[PDB]
């Protein structure tokens, strides 16, 4: 309609600074298909991989702190907790393990997932984590009693990212069924099922200050306030690659990594793509490989960290692009 | 669902369904289907409304054309005209670039002009083209076409101007200048000629000489200017030119 387009044209987005590559830390001998940082501090960030390991990394130096070898198969995801000094990690060996960070050694392997487990999210407020695998089910664990407390049946296929919010919409799943769910853990049921994607929403992330949750199928990055479970915006992601990552920055600077490796940045809520970045790879590696598989920002937000399939981790420092809608 | 309804031959329900479908900003195809259905039904009251709705939902100039075509098929000439006006008005109204390509608007304008021509009164077409010009190349072309169809002198002049512009862009030059002069307005033509001269190895020299000669001729037709030209030539530095100057 003309009534909306005109309005869109009238409104302007804020000039977010562009992004330039800063650090590249070829250290893993495998994909680096998870990355995470400490809520409390931003000194280190760990990165689980197809190595089977996960390595810890000092941001400032870029130096490899230490390794951790508590899986058999490849690590798919990790989550350092704000409220406790535990690092949860999870691998396609079906193990959702829990590393003490006072001793850097596993403690509570949680057992229950029938098959390769894709993501963890620690609940920001509770002493409870949430994991989901190709199982097609998101189980919540009491961390003390290392048992699945509840489980969330709804989904009809493998479930990827499964973020935890502190409100009522306490889990924000995202499947290959292309539904992204909002659940009520307490009710033992769904509350609202965002079906707006076309394909496997293989990426989703909570906004820090804004109580919303960007989510990405093969192209269209939707983003939504999950209070009602209502759409907020659609991003200009029109011919970008298969969106692997979908991290959001503190300053409303949503990042999206592709299977292409084209690092695409967007103003959040606007839905305005305001940068593209061509990937890079090593002289030995192939041009098809290069692809940002996992990524996240620091708590401040000036450094984006992208794990790419070059067996690398690339950290990114910081005139905006013209609007032009449909 | 629609086909089932058709088979049944209960039509109100089908209509309702169609309406519902069309409220969900569906495909152009759906809209077209709906239109077809409406046509098939006896009434042509409501079809217009639906078309309007479609247009509103799909700001696309092809839609407008389609609507017009329906109008044409229908008996009323006034209605078609009104529709055209509305289309034009809508295009005008969004001055901001929230728009279908400038080719599509041009096309629409052309169509309107054609319609007008087919109708009794031609002034209207001319007016429309003037309006178009005021609010580019495509538009100009359309205007020219309209003129041809039909004022003729004016059209010719416009064409000449366009040609001159093209030549300038490319940059024959002398010829262009001459044409401009002819078109003139006279003052403007003269200015253009002067500019050309200013703009203006052996071949180049020859061209320059020719230009100078032309200028001299112009002056004659119209002494100080000639003197100035001579001075300029001298500075640049021919014998023939000097001789001519002396004679003058």
């Amino acid at each position: 309609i003309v009534n909306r387009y005109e309005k869109l044209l009238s409104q302007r987005p804020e000039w977010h600074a562009p992004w330039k590559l800063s650090r590249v830390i070829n250290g893993h001998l495998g994909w680096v298909r998870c990355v995470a940082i400490d809520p409390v501090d931003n000194e280190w960030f760990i990165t689980g991989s197809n190595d089977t390991t996960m390595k810890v990394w000092d941001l400032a130096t870029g130096k490899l702190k230490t390794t951790l070898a508590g899986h058999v198969m490849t690590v798919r995801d990790v989550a350092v907790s704000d409220r406790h000094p535990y690092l949860f990690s999870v691998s396609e060996d079906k193990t959702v393990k829990c590393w003490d960070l006072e001793k850097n050694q596993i403690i509570r392997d949680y057992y229950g997932h029938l098959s390769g487990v894709r993501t963890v999210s620690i609940h920001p407020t509770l002493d409870l984590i949430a994991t989901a695998g190709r199982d097609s089910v998101i189980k919540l664990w009491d961390m003390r009693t290392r048992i699945p407390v509840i489980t969330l049946v709804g989904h009809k296929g493998p479930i990827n990212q499964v973020q935890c919010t502190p409100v009522d919409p306490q889990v924000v799943s995202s499947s290959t069924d292309a539904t992204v769910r909002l659940w009520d853990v307490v009710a033992g049921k769904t509350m609202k099922v965002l079906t707006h994607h076309k394909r496997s929403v293989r990426a989703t992330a909570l906004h820090p200050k804004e109580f919303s949750v960007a989510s990405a199928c093969t192209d269209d990055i939707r983003s939504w306030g999950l209070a009602e479970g209502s759409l907020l915006t659609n991003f200009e992601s029109e011919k970008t690659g298969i969106i692997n990552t979908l991290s959001i920055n503190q300053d409303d600077v949503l990042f999206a990594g592709g299977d292409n490796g084209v690092l695409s940045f967007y103003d959040y809520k606007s839905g305005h793509k305001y940068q593209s970045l061509a990937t890079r790879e090593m002289v030995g590696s192939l041009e098809g490989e290069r692809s940002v598989l996992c990524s996240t920002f620091d708590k401040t937000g000036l450094r984006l960290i992208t794990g790419e399939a070059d067996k690398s981790i690339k950290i990114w420092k910081q005139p905006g692009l013209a609007w032009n809608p449909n | 669902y629609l086909i089932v309804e058709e088979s049944l031959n209960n039509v109100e329900i089908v209509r309702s369904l169609y309406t519902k479908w069309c409220s969900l900003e569906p495909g152009v195809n759906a809209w077209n289907s709906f239109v077809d259905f409406e046509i098939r039904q006896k009434n042509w009251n409501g079809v217009r409304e639906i078309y309007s709705k479609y247009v509103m939902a799909h700001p696309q100039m092809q839609t407008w054309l389609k609507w017009v075509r329906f109008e044409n098929r229908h008996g009323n000439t006034e209605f078609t005209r009104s529709v055209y006006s509305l289309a034009i008005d809508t295009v005008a109204n969004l001055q901001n670039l929230q728009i279908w390509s400038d080719m599509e608007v041009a096309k629409l304008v052309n169509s309107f002009a054609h319609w007008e021509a087919a109708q009794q009164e031609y002034e209207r077409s001319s007016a429309l083209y003037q309006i178009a010009i005021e609010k580019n190349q495509l538009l100009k072309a359309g205007l020219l076409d309209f003129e041809k169809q039909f004022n003729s002198i004016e059209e010719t002049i416009s064409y000449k101007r366009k040609m001159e512009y093209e030549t300038i862009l490319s940059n024959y030059d002398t010829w262009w200048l001459y044409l401009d002069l002819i078109s003139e307005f006279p003052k403007q033509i003269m200015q253009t000629f002067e500019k050309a001269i200013v703009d203006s190895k052996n071949v180049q020299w020859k061209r320059y000489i020719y230009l100078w000669m032309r200028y001299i001729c112009y002056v004659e037709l119209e002494s100080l200017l000639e003197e100035e030209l001579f001075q300029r030539l001298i500075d640049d530095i021919f014998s023939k030119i000097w001789l001519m100057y002396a004679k003058f």
Partner: peptide, 24 residues
């Protein structure tokens, strides 16, 4: 009518696209 009730237009519409200062 029932069908219409079942699926509404505002679902397809993003809410932020109209109002930017609006924040959840």
């Amino acid at each position: 009518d029932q069908i219409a009730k079942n699926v509404k237009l505002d679902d397809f519409i993003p809410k932020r696209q109209s109002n930017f200062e609006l924040s959840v």
